[PDB]
Amino acid sequence: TIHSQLEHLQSKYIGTGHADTTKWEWLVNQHRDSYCSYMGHFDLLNYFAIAENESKARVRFNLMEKMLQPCGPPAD
Amino acid sequence: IPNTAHFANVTQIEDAVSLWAKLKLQKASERWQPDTEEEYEDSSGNVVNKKTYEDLKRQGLL
Amino acid sequence: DLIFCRKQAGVAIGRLCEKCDGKCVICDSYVRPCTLVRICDECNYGSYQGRCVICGGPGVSDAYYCKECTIQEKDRDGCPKIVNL
Amino acid sequence: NRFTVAELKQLVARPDVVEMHDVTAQDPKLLVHLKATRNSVPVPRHWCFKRKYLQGKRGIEKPPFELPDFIKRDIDYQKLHDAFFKWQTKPKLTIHGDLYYEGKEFEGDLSDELRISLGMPVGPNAHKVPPPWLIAMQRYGPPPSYPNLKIPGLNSPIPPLYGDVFGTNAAEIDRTPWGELE
Amino acid sequence: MGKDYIYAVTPLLEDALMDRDLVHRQTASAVVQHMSLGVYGFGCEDSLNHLLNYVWPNVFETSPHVIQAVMGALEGLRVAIGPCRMLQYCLQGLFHPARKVRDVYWKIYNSIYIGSQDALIAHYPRIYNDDKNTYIRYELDYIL
Amino acid sequence: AAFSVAVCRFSNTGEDWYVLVGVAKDLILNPRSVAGGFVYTYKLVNNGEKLEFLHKTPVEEVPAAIAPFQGRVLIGVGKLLRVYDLGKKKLLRKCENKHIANYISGIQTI
Amino acid sequence: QDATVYVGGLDEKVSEPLLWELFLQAGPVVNTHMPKDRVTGQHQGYGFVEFLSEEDADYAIKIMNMIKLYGKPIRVNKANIFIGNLDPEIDEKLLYDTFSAFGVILQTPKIMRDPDTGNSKGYAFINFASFDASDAAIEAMNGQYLCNRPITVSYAFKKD
RNA sequence: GCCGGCUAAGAUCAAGUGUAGUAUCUGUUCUUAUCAGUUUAAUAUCUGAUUCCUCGAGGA
Ligand SMILES: CC[C@H](O)[C@@H](C)[C@H]1O[C@@H]1C[C@@](C)(O)/C=C/C=C(\C)[C@H]1OC(=O)C[C@H](O)CC[C@@](C)(O)[C@@H](OC(=O)N2CCN(C3CCCCCC3)CC2)/C=C/[C@@H]1C
Ligand SMILES: [Zn+2]
Ligand SMILES: [Zn+2]
Ligand SMILES: [Zn+2]
């Protein structure tokens, strides 16, 4: 049953998929962990804050605000 | 219409001719056609008229 | 019913018995032990204080992950104690 | 409420990657788009077969194992070690996307042996010894398929010719690599 | 120590991976896994990609031991070869019409995703916006 | 918004130096949108101390890279790679490749 | 078939890349084909060289005609008396001109060809006007030195 | 495998033997048929309906 437990733990981790995963879930997952990776890495945030001419605190707050509904609301 | 991988699993005539029109338009668009795509400035005024194509330049230099 | 515990591991060190002394808990390899095993608090309590993580007999020495499991960061999951249901 | 092959071929930017079953997917537009990514080798092609990935034909009966050339040329001292690490060559390797499948295992200069079997003598120092195919080229003219080819007697001088080289192709920078060991 | 001997055993592993016997392919997969985790940071990616080209067709195997060895070899190649190559091998099957292909590919993808979730950020392919939803990541298109 | 700059000489002209500046027009970053682009040309006179405007050539996308090349200039106009010669009223398009993937961010020539 | 040239008269020293290497100076030979036998498993002396253009095949047929390759009369072409072991460089008109010195020919001769390539099989059949020309061919031509190929003339049908 | 075919290309349902595990063998049958539903990437599968000829018989 070790394989079955692995199949239950892999499902538990947030961001994993399965044969019924849609395009929307996949894309919002990669957008969300992209925003978290931007918040983590110090020189990517530097790049963005120089590009759009904003303070780094403002870019961080904008990314956190975008975290809620990236890619718009779902289908139907 | 040539036999290529694009025209596979296509069994009807009009579908084939329409997809051929589409592929023709796409490829003909994405090539580099120097005859109509080029900017020559003939020495007729030599400081004006850069809208000359590659054919009007020969007509002016003939 | 050979299932890992996979709970948050604490400060308790995993133990191995005389039969399992050189073994790796995850892949059962014997080559290059690399990382000390940690177990959760419910696996280390009362009568469960010193016990083999593989079988459950009286522990005699420290349990280790192998270098192969350490490279793949398989020491970062929960408690690796084998628990039967 | 599902596309047809020709209808979906009209929507996509790359119709030649569309296949029979592609119209039966839950999201064919994303499937065809991922099939066109500028990488990403395709599926192993035997998912729809019914022969368990091992074809029982093609005559797989063959030699067991051919060792490399370095294999053949105490048992051997550090000198034969030197030999094994001087003779070591890189084998043939396939690049990133070349998956294997059941079938894909079977599918002016002349050599000295052919010149010895044909009855042609060796090249002299200063004389004219043409091949018998050069008389037709001297009579009719140079071949239009290879105008840059040179033959001794017609375009190349007689003193040229050296060994088995009876012809040379004459086609009408800073190439040194940057960081390399000395 | 194996970094000097991968070129010598590659044709033998090729032969063993083309074989019909199941133990042959299972053991060759085990060898690939141990070799991959043995050389890591030593620049042996050519032979390992070549061998992945022969290991990958075995993902549609029903025998449990063979598929276990194949998963082990894939997770070793995830470390030695990198997650970008693995994602490139999984992309076209993630959304296949057949449910078997989707199950296998999503298992492999989840294994690739749980380890090195952060690196995958730089490897995802571009996906265009539709009428309803925005999918382009615009920040990465900035040019200083 | 200026994004590229180059100093070069053109073969059809003499030993005069020119400065080319690539400029975007009404660029939005998120969502990305641009109205167009321009290439400015200056003559760089008085022993390299003064710039004097010569003309201004419109392009349909942001020119992000400009590189001198064999007596002419290469320009990356968004996805497009073009060759440009100097003219009396604008820059004259000479050659073009249209198969580069997404967006040209740099051009280098040996 | 037009861009490909059929070569005849190849010995055991000639191989499949050897013909492409020898025909590389004449033109861009794209592929070489050698049909293997069923009893021996080797080439029967006849092969094909598929080039890119028809002019290269014409130059190879006009340059490598009646050549002595590997001790064999190799020749390239556009892809009751019995004569055996004849050279493929000769044609029907050439065989009719060679047979006109002994006796008078009744009609144009015919040469057998392979069902796969169609250039030359190895045997031919020719009919004379009278039996005196057949006896002169069996006395003189049956064993005469042809173009690097010992031919053998024999009677196709004889009644005891 | 041999020169498109000779039914060794697949599925299935009962029983026997045996392993830690995989398995191995026998009888079979294989719809030669149609429609509707389930389902399958598509098959498959399952769920239901559906007088004549010949020499007392057989076949459709
Ligand atoms: C596939 C083979 C099997 O799994 C087999 C090992 C096992 O199934 C049997 C059962 C059993 C109990 O008989 C196994 C025996 C165990 C062994 C032969 C291992 O030996 C030991 O346990 C001895 C002890 O635990 C530690 C010795 C040690 C450190 O050498 C250990 O091996 C290593 O860690 N290595 C491997 C790496 N090697 C190099 C050498 C350079 C510097 C040291 C580290 C790198 C050093 C030695 C044991 C090897 C045997 C496989
Ligand atoms: Zn381990
Ligand atoms: Zn124990
Ligand atoms: Zn625990």
Coordinates of N, CA, C and O in Angstrom, one line a residue, chain A residues 5-76:
Chain A
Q5 N -0.1 5.1 -0.8 CA 0.2 6.3 0.1 C 0.9 7.4 -0.6 O 0.5 8.6 -0.5
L6 N 1.8 7.0 -1.5 CA 2.6 8.0 -2.3 C 1.6 8.7 -3.2 O 1.7 10.0 -3.3
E7 N 0.6 8.0 -3.8 CA -0.4 8.5 -4.7 C -1.3 9.5 -3.9 O -1.9 10.4 -4.5
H8 N -1.4 9.2 -2.6 CA -2.3 10.2 -1.7 C -1.5 11.4 -1.3 O -2.1 12.5 -1.2
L9 N -0.2 11.2 -1.1 CA 0.7 12.3 -0.6 C 1.0 13.3 -1.8 O 1.1 14.5 -1.5
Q10 N 1.2 12.7 -3.0 CA 1.5 13.5 -4.2 C 0.2 14.4 -4.4 O 0.4 15.6 -4.7
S11 N -1.0 13.8 -4.3 CA -2.2 14.6 -4.5 C -2.3 15.7 -3.4 O -2.7 16.8 -3.8
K12 N -1.9 15.4 -2.2 CA -1.9 16.3 -1.0 C -1.0 17.6 -1.4 O -1.5 18.7 -1.2
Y13 N 0.2 17.4 -1.9 CA 1.0 18.6 -2.3 C 0.3 19.5 -3.2 O -0.3 19.0 -4.2
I14 N 0.3 20.8 -3.0 CA -0.4 21.7 -3.8 C 0.3 22.1 -5.0 O 1.5 22.4 -5.0
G15 N -0.3 22.0 -6.2 CA 0.3 22.1 -7.4 C 0.4 20.9 -8.3 O 0.8 21.0 -9.5
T16 N 0.2 19.7 -7.7 CA 0.2 18.5 -8.5 C -1.1 18.3 -9.3 O -2.1 18.9 -9.0
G17 N -1.0 17.5 -10.4 CA -2.2 17.3 -11.2 C -2.6 15.8 -11.3 O -2.1 15.0 -10.6
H18 N -3.4 15.6 -12.3 CA -4.0 14.2 -12.6 C -4.7 14.3 -13.9 O -4.7 15.3 -14.6
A19 N -5.2 13.1 -14.3 CA -5.8 13.0 -15.7 C -7.0 13.8 -15.9 O -7.4 14.0 -17.1
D20 N -7.6 14.5 -14.9 CA -8.7 15.4 -15.1 C -8.4 16.8 -14.9 O -9.3 17.6 -14.8
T21 N -7.1 17.2 -14.8 CA -6.7 18.6 -14.6 C -7.0 19.3 -15.9 O -6.7 18.9 -17.0
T22 N -7.5 20.5 -15.7 CA -7.9 21.4 -16.8 C -6.7 22.4 -17.0 O -5.8 22.6 -16.2
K23 N -6.8 23.1 -18.2 CA -5.9 24.2 -18.5 C -5.9 25.3 -17.5 O -4.8 25.8 -17.1
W24 N -7.0 25.7 -17.0 CA -7.1 26.8 -16.0 C -6.4 26.5 -14.7 O -5.7 27.4 -14.2
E25 N -6.6 25.3 -14.2 CA -5.9 25.0 -12.9 C -4.4 24.9 -13.1 O -3.7 25.5 -12.2
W26 N -3.9 24.3 -14.1 CA -2.5 24.3 -14.4 C -1.9 25.7 -14.5 O -0.9 26.0 -13.9
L27 N -2.6 26.6 -15.2 CA -2.0 27.9 -15.5 C -2.1 28.8 -14.2 O -1.1 29.5 -14.0
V28 N -3.1 28.7 -13.4 CA -3.2 29.4 -12.2 C -2.1 28.9 -11.2 O -1.5 29.7 -10.5
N29 N -1.9 27.6 -11.2 CA -0.8 27.0 -10.4 C 0.5 27.6 -10.7 O 1.3 28.0 -9.9
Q30 N 0.9 27.6 -12.0 CA 2.2 28.1 -12.4 C 2.3 29.7 -12.2 O 3.3 30.2 -11.8
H31 N 1.2 30.4 -12.4 CA 1.2 31.8 -12.1 C 1.4 32.1 -10.6 O 2.2 33.0 -10.2
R32 N 0.8 31.3 -9.8 CA 0.9 31.5 -8.3 C 2.3 31.2 -7.8 O 2.9 32.0 -7.1
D33 N 2.9 30.1 -8.3 CA 4.2 29.9 -7.8 C 5.3 30.7 -8.5 O 6.4 30.9 -8.0
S34 N 4.9 31.3 -9.7 CA 5.8 32.3 -10.3 C 5.8 33.6 -9.4 O 6.9 34.1 -9.1
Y35 N 4.7 34.0 -9.0 CA 4.6 35.2 -8.1 C 5.4 34.9 -6.8 O 6.1 35.8 -6.3
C36 N 5.2 33.7 -6.2 CA 6.0 33.4 -5.0 C 7.5 33.4 -5.2 O 8.3 33.9 -4.4
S37 N 7.9 32.8 -6.4 CA 9.3 32.8 -6.7 C 9.9 34.3 -6.9 O 11.0 34.5 -6.6
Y38 N 9.0 35.2 -7.5 CA 9.4 36.5 -7.6 C 9.6 37.2 -6.2 O 10.6 37.9 -6.0
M39 N 8.7 36.9 -5.3 CA 8.8 37.4 -4.0 C 10.0 36.9 -3.3 O 10.6 37.6 -2.4
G40 N 10.4 35.6 -3.6 CA 11.6 35.0 -2.9 C 12.9 35.6 -3.4 O 13.8 36.0 -2.6
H41 N 13.1 35.5 -4.7 CA 14.4 35.9 -5.2 C 14.6 37.4 -5.3 O 13.8 38.1 -5.8
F42 N 15.7 37.8 -4.6 CA 16.0 39.3 -4.4 C 16.3 40.0 -5.7 O 15.9 41.2 -5.8
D43 N 17.0 39.4 -6.7 CA 17.4 40.1 -7.9 C 16.3 40.1 -9.0 O 16.4 40.9 -9.9
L44 N 15.3 39.2 -8.9 CA 14.2 39.3 -9.9 C 13.3 40.5 -9.5 O 12.9 41.2 -10.4
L45 N 13.0 40.7 -8.3 CA 12.2 41.8 -7.8 C 13.0 43.1 -8.1 O 12.3 44.1 -8.5
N46 N 14.3 43.1 -8.0 CA 15.1 44.3 -8.4 C 14.8 44.6 -9.9 O 14.6 45.8 -10.3
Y47 N 14.9 43.6 -10.7 CA 14.7 43.8 -12.2 C 13.3 44.4 -12.4 O 13.2 45.3 -13.2
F48 N 12.3 43.8 -11.8 CA 11.0 44.3 -12.1 C 10.8 45.8 -11.6 O 10.2 46.6 -12.2
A49 N 11.4 46.1 -10.4 CA 11.2 47.4 -9.8 C 12.0 48.5 -10.6 O 11.6 49.6 -10.6
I50 N 13.1 48.1 -11.2 CA 13.8 49.0 -12.1 C 13.0 49.1 -13.4 O 12.9 50.2 -14.0
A51 N 12.4 48.0 -13.9 CA 11.7 48.1 -15.2 C 10.5 49.0 -15.2 O 10.3 49.8 -16.1
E52 N 9.6 48.8 -14.1 CA 8.4 49.6 -14.1 C 8.5 50.8 -13.2 O 7.5 51.5 -13.0
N53 N 9.7 51.2 -12.7 CA 9.9 52.4 -11.9 C 9.0 52.5 -10.7 O 8.2 53.4 -10.6
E54 N 9.1 51.5 -9.8 CA 8.4 51.5 -8.6 C 9.3 51.1 -7.4 O 10.4 50.6 -7.7
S55 N 8.8 51.4 -6.2 CA 9.5 50.9 -5.0 C 9.3 49.4 -4.9 O 8.3 48.9 -5.4
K56 N 10.2 48.7 -4.3 CA 10.2 47.3 -4.1 C 9.0 46.8 -3.3 O 8.4 45.8 -3.5
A57 N 8.7 47.6 -2.2 CA 7.6 47.3 -1.4 C 6.3 47.4 -2.2 O 5.4 46.6 -2.0
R58 N 6.2 48.3 -3.1 CA 5.0 48.4 -4.0 C 4.9 47.3 -4.9 O 3.8 46.7 -5.1
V59 N 6.0 46.8 -5.5 CA 5.9 45.6 -6.4 C 5.5 44.4 -5.6 O 4.7 43.6 -6.0
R60 N 6.1 44.2 -4.4 CA 5.7 43.1 -3.5 C 4.2 43.1 -3.2 O 3.5 42.1 -3.3
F61 N 3.7 44.3 -2.8 CA 2.2 44.4 -2.5 C 1.4 44.1 -3.7 O 0.3 43.5 -3.6
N62 N 1.8 44.6 -4.9 CA 1.1 44.3 -6.1 C 1.0 42.8 -6.4 O 0.0 42.3 -6.9
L63 N 2.2 42.1 -6.3 CA 2.2 40.7 -6.5 C 1.3 40.0 -5.5 O 0.6 39.0 -5.9
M64 N 1.3 40.3 -4.2 CA 0.4 39.7 -3.3 C -1.0 40.0 -3.6 O -1.8 39.1 -3.4
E65 N -1.4 41.1 -4.1 CA -2.7 41.4 -4.5 C -3.1 40.6 -5.8 O -4.3 40.2 -5.9
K66 N -2.2 40.4 -6.7 CA -2.4 39.6 -7.9 C -2.5 38.1 -7.5 O -3.0 37.3 -8.3
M67 N -2.0 37.7 -6.4 CA -2.0 36.3 -6.0 C -3.4 35.7 -5.9 O -3.6 34.5 -6.3
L68 N -4.4 36.5 -5.5 CA -5.8 36.0 -5.2 C -6.5 35.5 -6.5 O -7.0 34.3 -6.4
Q69 N -6.6 36.3 -7.6 CA -7.3 35.7 -8.8 C -6.4 35.9 -10.0 O -6.8 36.8 -10.8
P70 N -5.3 35.2 -10.2 CA -4.6 35.3 -11.5 C -5.4 34.5 -12.5 O -6.1 33.6 -12.2
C71 N -5.2 34.9 -13.8 CA -5.8 34.4 -15.0 C -7.4 34.6 -15.1 O -8.0 34.0 -16.0
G72 N -7.9 35.4 -14.3 CA -9.4 35.8 -14.3 C -10.2 34.7 -13.5 O -9.6 33.8 -13.0
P73 N -11.6 34.9 -13.4 CA -12.5 33.9 -12.8 C -12.6 32.7 -13.7 O -12.5 32.9 -14.9
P74 N -12.9 31.3 -13.2 CA -13.0 30.0 -13.9 C -14.2 30.0 -14.9 O -14.9 31.0 -15.1
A75 N -14.4 28.8 -15.5 CA -15.3 28.7 -16.6 C -16.7 28.4 -16.1 O -16.9 28.0 -14.9
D76 N -17.7 28.6 -16.9 CA -19.1 28.4 -16.7 C -19.6 28.9 -15.3 O -20.8 29.2 -15.1

